[PDB]
Structures are given as C-alpha cells and as structure tokens.
Design a binder for this molecule. Structure first.
Ligand SMILES: Nc1ncnc2c1ncn2[C@@H]1O[C@H](COP(=O)(O)OP(=O)(O)O)[C@@H](O)[C@H]1O
Ligand SMILES: [Mn+2]
Length: 430
C-alpha cells in the first residue's frame, strides 16, 4: 500500500478494523521506511480516539484535542486550511485519510489535492472508508447480523401510530435531516419520558461526551455522526433524509429538501450498529429510499473554490478525486483569487465562520474582512427573519438595521445558533 504513485482505497466493511487494527500497522511500516506521513482524522473526537489506537508510536498530534516525529496527525479541515494559508505544509510522502467518505468541502478538497499529488507521481495515499465515492450498497456486511426494516419514520411530533419508536427498551441513534427537525423530535421524545441527547456539526465535539457521561435513551443527530462516531446502541432509526445546499441561479444558496441520502450515507448511518460480533440482532429502521443527492450539492462546488486557491505547482490546479469529480459543473481555476483576496477568503471562513460559498462572494467582490456593509444592502427578498419578523442588529456604528445580506446563503440562518452567529458577524463582533 505504501509504494509511491499508488492510491489505495481501503474499503473493508464497517467495523472490520480499518481504524483500530490496520492503521497502526501502516504507521509502524511508514516509520520503518522513513516516510513522512500525515494521518487525517475527520473530527477532533476521532483524533483523540486515534491517539489511543496509536499509543506508543511516535506521532505528532497537531490538534488541542489530544493531551500528549515523522508522522503528523491533524483534522481534515486543518490540512486544507494550512494548504490555503502561507504556512508551510510538508510534502507528505504518505497521505492517510481516515473516514475518507466525509463530504465536508475541506475533506473533498483534501482528497483532490492528495489524489493529484499521487497522480503527478509525488506521493502515496490511502483512503480509508467502508463507503467509497459512488457506492451503491446501502446494506454492506457487518460484524454481526443486522435486522433491516423499511418503516414510516416520524419527522414531526407524533401522538399515536409509532408505538415501536417508544416501546424499545435499548438505546437508539436517530438520524434526522436538520437541527430544527431534531429539536421537534427531541421535545416529543422527552415529553414521552425519554432522555435525549442532540448532536450536530457545531455541537458535536462538545456534546458527544454526554453519550459517555450521561444515561440516555436516544441520540438525535444530523449526518455528522456518519464520520466515525461510536455509540453503544442497539438500534438506528434513519429518516434517510438530508438537506441539500444548492446554488440557485449562481446567486444564492438554499437548503433544498429534505430529500434522500446517498447510499454511502445510508450505509454509514446503518453502520453505527451491528459492530459487536457478540451482539447480533441490532436493528436498523429506515424511512425512505436512497438517491444520488450529492450531484449538484454545493459542497462539491465549495471544494473547487478551496482547491482553486491551493498552490500545487506554478499555475496548475488540483482536480477533485476522480470518482467524485462529476458532482459539480465548474471551470477549473474559475475561483482562483489573488494573494490579498485569498487571505480575506480564508479569514471569512475561519474567524468569520461563514460558509465557503458566501465567503467567496464577499472576498471576490473586493470587500475586506471587517467591512460588514454588505450584510445590510441586499435586496428585499434577502431579508433574514427571526420569529417571523425581520431580524435586526445594531451595526458597529450603533445603528439598528434589518439583516439583509447582499448574498443570501440559507446556512447562516437555518437554526437559532446559526442566526445568532451571523447576527454577531453582521454587527462587527468578530
Ligand atoms: N474503545 C474500544 N474498545 C474496544 N473495541 C472497540 C473500541 N472502539 C471500537 N471498537 C471495536 O473495534 C472494531 C473495529 O473498529 P474500527 O477499527 O473503528 O472499524 P472500522 O474503522 O473498520 O469501521 C469494531 O468492532 C468496534 O466496535
Ligand atoms: Mn474507521
């Protein structure tokens, strides 16, 4: 697997031991061969788990998530961020991506960068995932048999007709299509006397610990838990539905759907259970079919925005990883920014915590990071609502204004927490 100019897809079925058994073997061999190696973990939670699997081995943990060399370990997003910034990144001879199905824009971009370096003959790479891009198998092998049942799954509060949900006496991981939908289901379950933990992208690294430290009956989670999150559960309830960010008329981003998940997403959701060879009969209840909803999904356009701004060699631009390259229609290099606008782009995404697409619109317009006039001078149909009335903030000048951004990205106000963060941004508070 370790030879140069080779990209290996390590696609053992879920729970087969890719992360805990195969990975340390790979690391020991890479150290013996003096290969400069990067290990890419999807989340800080997984990075901390990897330190336990890699205990003893000389690995530099480039994250504060690990309380503790020619092997570096960092998060997917950190790798892509460092490539975008002036910071020097080693030309790693061996690039290991764990949970390489992650569809975050930074993860897609990292796969494009790594796979291009391999294609140029400069490096080796190992992509670890049970569900490579394009998988059509929602029901892969597992360590113990799974009971699969197609069934109508509630997506709103319910009173009758779903007794099977609450009659269960084990622990359930329930994949919902959005934070707001999960809030409603959570409230309904809590009213029925269940103890519920909710997880989403921005709360995961913090709230996941409650699944170890607290008694719980349900974990209500968005698709973030598709990325190596381990639960001691015996049932998965899968709405089989997700929101799809879509760029409309090249001018705005909406959150379309909910709509079907990909086969890979469904397989990863189901793959939370059936992982213990000593506990057969975990249950997977699924509420819809699968479809290729990554086609036209904004994350792959946003990956091209990132990759267009990563230096590879002179003027060349890395391509997306071939199996996922057709999921976006874009002109190669069309998002490349000059030095100063690229710095603004990066700052809008990191400190600004704006979605990639929105950060690009602002930076490519020549706006500097601290200049928030664009948050207020949009068209009337770009007005953002809070509790059914136009949302308002005090500008950094002390004037109360309606939030009406020049470019509208639905992800800045899809839940209360997102809106709170964007209001603070519009006010100049970060
Ligand atoms: N902390 C742990 N202690 C013991 N076994 C674990 C632990 N975490 C995961 N496992 C088990 O180890 C096996 C392999 O896990 P893993 O390497 O994560 O599989 P994969 O990466 O192929 O999905 C699975 O059966 C999983 O349930
Ligand atoms: Mn794994």
């Amino acid at each position: 697997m370790l030879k140069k100019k080779q990209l290996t897809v390590l696609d053992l079925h879920p729970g087969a031991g890719k992360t805990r058994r195969v990975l340390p073997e790979i690391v020991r061999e890479a150290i013996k061969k003096r290969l400069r190696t990067v290990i890419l973990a999807p989340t800080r939670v997984v990075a901390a788990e990897m330190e336990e699997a890699l205990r003893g081995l000389p690995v530099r943990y480039m994250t504060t998530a690990v309380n503790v060399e020619i092997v570096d370990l960092m998060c997917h997003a950190t790798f892509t961020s460092r490539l975008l910034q002036p910071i020097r990144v080693p030309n790693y001879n061996l690039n290991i991506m764990d949970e390489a199905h992650f569809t975050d824009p930074s993860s897609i971009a990292a796969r494009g960068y790594i796979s291009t370096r391999v294609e140029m003959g400069e490096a080796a790479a190992i992509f670890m995932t049970a569900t490579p891009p394009g998988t059509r198998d929602a029901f892969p092998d597992s360590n113990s048999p799974i009971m699969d049942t197609e069934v109508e799954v509630p997506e709103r509060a319910w009173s009758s007709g779903f007794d099977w949900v609450t009659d269960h006496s084990g622990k359930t991981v329930w994949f919902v299509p959005s934070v707001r939908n999960g809030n409603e289901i959570a409230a309904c379950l809590t009213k029925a006397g269940k103890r519920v933990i909710q997880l989403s992208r921005k709360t995961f690294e913090t709230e996941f610990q409650k699944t170890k430290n607290q008694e719980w009956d349900f974990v209500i989670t968005t698709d973030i838990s598709e990325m190596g999150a381990n639960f001691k559960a015996d049932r998965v309830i899968d709405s089989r539905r997700c929101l799809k960010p879509v760029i409309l008329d090249g001018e705005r981003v909406i959150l379309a759907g909910p709509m079907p998940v990909t086969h890979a997403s469904a397989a990863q959701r189901r793959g939370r259970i059936g992982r213990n060879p000593n506990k057969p009969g975990d249950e997977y209840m699924y509420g819809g079919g699968c479809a290729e909803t990554d086609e036209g999904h904004a994350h792959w356009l946003e990956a091209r925005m990132l990759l267009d701004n990563i230096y590879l060699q002179d003027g060349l631009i890395a391509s997306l990883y071939r199996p996922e390259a057709d999921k976006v229609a874009a002109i190669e290099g069309e998002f490349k920014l000059r030095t100063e606008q690229r710095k603004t782009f990066v700052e809008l995404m990191k400190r600004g915590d704006l979605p990639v697409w929105l950060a690009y619109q602002v930076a490519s317009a020549g706006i500097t990071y601290t200049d928030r006039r664009w948050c207020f001078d949009g068209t009337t149909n770009n007005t953002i609502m809070e509790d059914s009335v136009p949302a308002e903030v005090w500008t950094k000048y002390g004037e109360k204004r309606v939030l009406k951004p020049r470019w509208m990205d639905a992800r800045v106000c899809s839940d209360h927490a997102a809106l709170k963060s964007f209001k603070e941004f519009a006010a100049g508070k970060r």
